[PDB]
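ARCHIVE CARD
Drawer: 12
Card no.: 0347
Subject: one protein chain, sequence and derived structure
Cross-reference: see card 0346
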Amino acid sequence: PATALNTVTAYGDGYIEVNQVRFSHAIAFAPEGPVASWPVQRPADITASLLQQAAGLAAPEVLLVGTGRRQHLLGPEQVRPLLAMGVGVEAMDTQAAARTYNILMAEGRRVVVALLPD
């Protein structure tokens, strides 16, 4: 029916609050579904394999990637498979990723977000 959507509630130094619950480990999620844990810890150990599993939960317009405190450029070997699927990815510091997610979500776009906290 009218399923409630996942919403980034607050952002903090060292945490993202989703649906009023704090997370201090990396997570990934779409508007619908659970807020899943994402096996990453440094923008350095981010792999296309990891990006696809995050996006792999529901085909999505954009995969937002929060690389933590500051933006971290993702390379061709990270991002190509996804484009190979017409999925566009955007890396940016985490507080912006979270905030950009709420927006893309509010205007009803098919969006997934992956975030490394702190």
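Annotation on reverse: Residues 94-106 form the longest helix (13 residues). The beta strands are 8-12, 15-18, 21-23, 27-29, 36-37, 62-66, 88-92, 111-115.
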